Ligand binder design. Structure first.
Ligand SMILES: Nc1ncnc2c1ncn2[C@@H]1O[C@H](CO)[C@@H](OP(=O)(O)OC[C@@H]2O[C@H](n3cnc4c(N)ncnc43)[C@H]3OP(=O)(O)O[C@H]32)[C@H]1O
Ligand SMILES: Nc1ncnc2c1ncn2[C@@H]1O[C@H](CO)[C@@H](OP(=O)(O)OC[C@@H]2O[C@H](n3cnc4c(N)ncnc43)[C@H]3OP(=O)(O)O[C@H]32)[C@H]1O
Ligand SMILES: Nc1ncnc2c1ncn2[C@@H]1O[C@H](CO)[C@H]2OP(=O)(O)O[C@H]21
Ligand SMILES: Nc1ncnc2c1ncn2[C@@H]1O[C@H](CO)[C@H]2OP(=O)(O)O[C@H]21
Lengths: 433, 432
C-alpha cells in the first residue's frame, strides 16, 4: 500500500511554474501531477481548510462547494480523481466570509478522517507533500499522520517520506525542485495515554453554560465510558507494558468504540452555526483530547483485531500474540515468563498429571509467604502473576510433551484477579503519563 | 525553566497589526512581544532562513548581514537580551541571491543549534510559535524540537505548547488571536536508532565523488567511529532495553562526542562556496542521518550524565540509576533481577562468606552446559547475564545484612563478556 497525502492552501491563487522531481519535469500550478507520476500511489488524500468555501446557506453546501472547486482544479491539472478530500475546519476572518472556532479542531477532524482512510492491514509506504499548505493545518496534518502511523507500525512495516518544493519568487522562478525533507522508518508506538476526565471530549467554544451542560448530559458516550474507562486503560497498558493475556481478555468492543466516536463527531457537527446573510460559520463546540484518544484507541484495536481468539487461551497462543505485539527486552521477558509456565506443564505431563482450574501459585509450587498482588510482580512477570492467574492442563496421551504442553495448557485471570490487574495497569498507565 | 521558540521568514515585510493572547492585547509587526508578555520565558530562540542575506562577499558576511537586520528588528519592538538567533541554511532562487544545497541541512543545523541551547538539567516548559516562517523550515524546526524534548523527557518533566495566529488578511484584518494548536506532556523517548554506515555522516550535494572520498578519508571522526560505533550502540541499547550496568560501563565521552560533531560541522561549513559576482551560495556537503544521530546521542549523554556514579558499581547504585532511568514494566523487571542478586548477597553475608572476583553463574549456583550467551538471556535479565558478569563482595562485619549487602556487593562485565553483550545489544538495536 502506497499512500500520497498533500496539504493545500488557496490552490486557486497559485501561479503556473515548472517542477523538477525524480528525473521528470512538469508545467502547472501544483506538484500533485508530477508527485502522482513519479510515486504512482495506490491512493491520494488532499487536506485543505474550510475557509476556501464561499457558500453559507448551510454547512453541507460549504463542504460541497470546496469539494467541487477541488475536483474542477484536478481537471485543470493532470490529476486523477482517485482521491479523498478532507475539508478541515479552519479559522480566520476573510473578505468572502468569517470562520470562528477552536484552531485545534483541524487536528482532531483530520486525525478522525485519516483513521477511516489509512488501511489497518498490510505494510504502508506514506508520502506527505507540504509545498503550498497553510503552516498550522500542515503541522496538524503532519502530527495526525505520525500519531496513526506510529500505531500502525506495531503490526506492520511503515515508511514515511515528506516533500517540500523550493520557495516560489514571482518571475525569478524557472524550475522549482521538490526536495525530500524526511525519510523515516516509523518507530512502533502503541497508545500510551489514559482516557481523560469527562470535560475533555467536547468543550464549549461559543455556547451558553446551560446549553452545553444539556448537550454534555445528552451523550451516551460519557455515561457508558464512565464504567468502561478502567477496562480500556487496562487494554492500552497490555500493549505498552507487555501483558499478552490482558491484551486478549480486555480486547475492546470495536462496535462500541465506533459508536462513541460517531456520537461525539455528530454532536460537534450539529453545533456548527452557519448564519447565511452575514456570511459566518461558528463551531460552538470544540473537540477535546479525549476524542483524539478514542480515535487512536479504535485504530489500534483495528490494527490488532487479527490476533484475538475465543476464550480458552493456550501458552502457544500467548507466544504467537507476543511475537507480533512486542520487541526488544519486552518480547524476550514475555518468552522467559511463558517458558517457565511451559517447563512446569512439561514436568506435570511427564508424571502423567493434568491439573484443572488450579491457581498458578499452586501450579508452580509457591510458599505461603506473599499472597498480596503488587505492581512490581504484575509488571515484571508479563502480567502472569501467581495470585490472579488460573491454569488448566487439558488431559492428553504424551509422547513428545516438550512440543505438546503449550497447546494443552490454558491461562485465564480469576474474576477477582482480573479486577486487581485492571487497577494496577490503569494506575501504572496514568503514573507514566 | 520556560523556553519560547519562533520560526521567522522575511520579518521586514511584516505589516503593523494588533494581537490577542491570554487576556492581553499588543500592536506591532510580530507576535514575539505579546508571547514574551503572556508566557514570561526564561529564554527565547529565533530560527531564521539565511536566504534573506544580500551582501555575498563571503559566508561570514552573509550571517553578519542577516544577524545585523535581526538585532535591529529585536531592538525595534523590544525582544530583550535573553535571545539566541539561529540562522539556518535555506535554499531557493531569490531576487537578491541564489542558495543551493540539501533542504534537510536546515533540520540537522537547527537540531545541532537547539542541542546547545535547551537546558539538560531540570524540568522544561516549551512554547513554539509557527505563525510566520518558510513552511518547510518551520516543519523541520518543529521536528528538531520534538526529537530533542523526547530525549529530555527521559529524565525531566517536559510540556510543549504550539501556537499559530489567525491568518493576517490585509484588506479586512482588525485584530488576530494567537490560537493554541497543541498542548502535550512530552513522552520519554530514548534514542532508538543505530549509528549508520560511514557514508551517512556528511554527503556530497554538488561535489565530484573523487573529492568526497579524499575528504571522507581525512576526517579523524569517521576513523575514531570505526573503533567506538559498537560501544556507542551498546550504550543506546542500555537505555532502550533496560541494561543498567551497561549504561554505566559504556557511558560515552561527552568531550570526544563534542569534537566529532564540531569536526563534521566546520567541514560542512568549509565546503560552502560563496561567489560574490554571481550572488550564489552552494553547500557542496549535506549533513547525513549520522550527524543527526551523534547530536541526539551527545544530548542524551548530557541529560543522563548525573547518573554516572563513582565505581565500583554496587547493587545499591544500580537500583538508584534504574529508579531514575526506567519506567513501567522495564523498571520493575530490573528491580526484580537486581533483587535476585541482592537476596543471594544477603544469604552469603549471613554465613560470613564474601566471594571476590567470582562469575555471576558461580555466585548464584548454576548448572553446567548453559555457558552460551544468548540475546534472550542478556535482554530478559536486564543485561545481568550469568556468563558475562563478575561479582565481588567487599568483606565487612555484618549487623543487619539485608540493608548492608546492597552497598558491599559490586558487579562488572568480564572483558570477554562485555564484547558479547556489545555484539548482542548492537545487533538487537539494528533489528530494533
Ligand atoms: N503582521 C503580519 N504581517 C504579514 N503576515 C503575518 C502577520 N502576522 C501573522 N502573519 C502570518 O504570516 C504568514 C505570512 O504572511 C501568514 O501565515 P499563513 O496565513 O499561514 O500563510 C500561508 C498562506 O496563506 C494563504 N491564503 C491566502 N488566502 C487564504 C485564504 N483565503 N484562506 C486560507 N489560506 C489563504 C495560503 O494559500 P497558499 O497555500 O498560497 O499560501 C498560504 C500570515 O497569516
Ligand atoms: N506554484 C506556486 N504558486 C504560489 N506558491 C507556491 C507555488 N509553489 C510553491 N509555492 C510555495 O507555496 C507557499 C504559498 O505561496 C510559499 O511558501 P511559504 O513557505 O508558505 O512562503 C510564505 C512566505 O514566503 C516568505 N519569504 C519570501 N522570501 C523569503 C525569503 N527569501 N526568506 C525567508 N522567507 C521568505 C516568508 O516570509 P513570511 O514569514 O512573511 O511568510 C513566508 C511558496 O514558496
Ligand atoms: N508474586 C510473584 N512473586 C514471584 N514470582 C512470580 C510472582 N508471580 C509470578 N511470578 C513468576 O513469573 C513467572 C510467570 O508466571 C513464573 O515463573 P517462576 O519464577 O516459577 O514464578 C512465576
Ligand atoms: N543464562 C541465564 N539463564 C537463566 N537465568 C539467568 C541467566 N543469566 C542470568 N539469569 C538470571 O538473571 C538474574 C540477574 O542476574 C539472576 O537471578 P536468578 O533467577 O537467580 O538467575 C539470574
Amino acid at each position: 500500500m502506497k499512500l500520497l497525502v498533500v496539504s493545500w492552501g488557496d490552490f486557486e491563487r497559485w501561479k503556473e511554474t515548472k517542477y523538477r522531481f525524480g528525473g521528470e519535469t512538469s508545467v502547472g500550478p501544483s506538484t500533485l501531477p508530477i508527485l502522482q507520476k513519479v510515486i504512482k500511489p495506490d491512493w491520494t488524500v488532499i487536506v485543505l481548510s474550510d475557509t476556501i468555501g464561499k457558500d453559507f446557506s448551510s454547512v453541507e453546501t460549504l463542504r460541497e462547494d470546496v469539494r467541487n472547486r477541488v475536483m474542477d482544479f484536478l481537471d485543470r491539472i493532470g490529476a486523477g480523481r482517485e482521491v479523498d478530500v478532507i475539508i478541515a475546519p479552519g479559522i480566520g476572518e476573510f473578505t468572502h466570509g468569517s470562520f470562528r472556532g477552536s484552531a485545534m479542531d483541524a487536528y482532531y477532524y483530520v486525525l478522525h478522517a485519516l483513521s477511516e482512510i489509512i488501511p489497518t492491514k498490510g505494510d504502508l509506504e506514506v508520502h506527505f507533500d507540504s509545498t503550498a499548505g497553510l503552516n498550522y493545518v500542515t503541522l496538524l496534518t503532519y502530527r495526525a499522520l505520525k500519531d496513526l502511523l506510529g500505531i500502525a507500525a506495531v503490526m506492520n512495516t511503515v515508511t514515511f517520506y515528506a516533500y517540500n518544493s523550493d520557495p516560489f519568487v514571482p518571475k525569478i522562478t524557472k524550475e522549482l525542485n521538490i526536495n525530500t525533507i524526511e525519510t523515516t522508518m516509523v518507530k512502533p508506538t502503541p497508545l500510551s495515554e489514559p482516557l481523560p476526565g469527562f470535560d475533555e471530549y467536547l468543550c464549549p467554544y461559543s455556547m451558553e453554560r446551560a446549553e452545553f451542560v444539556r448537550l454534555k448530559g445528552s451523550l451516551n458516550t460519557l455515561k457508558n465510558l464512565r464504567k468502561e474507562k478502567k477496562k480500556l486503560e487496562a487494554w492500552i497498558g497490555s500493549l505498552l507494558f507487555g501483558l499478552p493475556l490482558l491484551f486478549l481478555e480486555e480486547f475492546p468492543d470495536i462496535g462500541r468504540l465506533e459508536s462513541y466516536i460517531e456520537e461525539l463527531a455528530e454532536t460537534w457537527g450539529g453545533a456548527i452555526a452557519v448564519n447565511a446573510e452575514e456570511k459566518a460559520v461558528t463551531r460552538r463546540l470544540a473537540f477535546g483530547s479525549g476524542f483524539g484518544t478514542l480515535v487512536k484507541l479504535l485504530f489500534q484495536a483495528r490494527i490488532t483485531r487479527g490476533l484475538l481468539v475465543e476464550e480458552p487461551y493456550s501458552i502457544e497462543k500467548l507466544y504467537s500474540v507476543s511475537d507480533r505485539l512486542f520487541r526488544g527486552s519486552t518480547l524476550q521477558r514475555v518468552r522467559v515468563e511463558l517458558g517457565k509456565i511451559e517447563d512446569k506443564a512439561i514436568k506435570y505431563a511427564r508424571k502423567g498429571a493434568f491439573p484443572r482450574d488450579i491457581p498458578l501459585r499452586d501450579f508452580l509450587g509457591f510458599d505461603a509467604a506473599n499472597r498480596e498482588v503488587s505492581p512490581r510482580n504484575v509488571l515484571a512477570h508479563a502480567g502472569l502473576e501467581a495470585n490472579v492467574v488460573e491454569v488448566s492442563m487439558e488431559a492428553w496421551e504424551p509422547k513428545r510433551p516438550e512440543e505438546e504442553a503449550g497447546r494443552h495448557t490454558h491461562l485465564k485471570y480469576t474474576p477477582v484477579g482480573l479486577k486487581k490487574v485492571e487497577d494496577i495497569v490503569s494506575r501504572a498507565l496514568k503514573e507514566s503519563h
